[PDB]
Amino acid sequence: GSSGSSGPIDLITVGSLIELQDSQNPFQYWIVSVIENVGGRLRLRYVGLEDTESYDQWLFYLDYRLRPVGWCQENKYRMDPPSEIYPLKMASEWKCTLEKSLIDAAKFPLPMEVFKDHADLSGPSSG
C-alpha cells in the first residue's frame, strides 16, 4: 500500500469503482475500476478488459472526467463503452461486467469528500 499525507489520496483505494468520460464521446460515459493508486495515480481500466492490460488508462484524482457512479442513473444520457472496445467483446460481455460492477460500487463506494469541489453552477445565459 502507501500511507502519505492526509488527503483524498488515502480516501481512494485500489479497486474503487468510478465513472469516466470519453475523449470523443463527452455525453457518453463508462464504468471503470481503480487498478492501482500511485500517489494519486489511479490506473483506470474499462470493466471487462481486466484480463488484458493494453486498453488501460492512467489519470489523477484531480481530474474532471472522474465522476461518482450513480449520477448517470438520474438522466441516463448514454451509458455505453467506446467503439474501440465495444466490438472487441460481445454486447453481452459489455453488459455483464457493466451490471455486476454497478453493484460492486455499492459495496465498495467512496466518500463524496474525494470529489469535493465547487464552481460556477448558475443557470445558463443567452448570448
From Swiss-Prot:
Coiled-coil region list: none
Localization, UniProt: Nucleus
Top-level lineage group: Eukaryota
First and last residues of every MBT repeat: 8-82
Assembly information from the UniProt record: Interacts with YY1. Interacts with methylated histones H3K9me2 and H4K20me2, but not with H3K4me2, nor H3K9Ac.
Stated role: Transcriptional repressor of HOXB13 gene.
Protein name: Scm-like with four MBT domains protein 2
Organism: Homo sapiens (Human)
Gene: SFMBT2
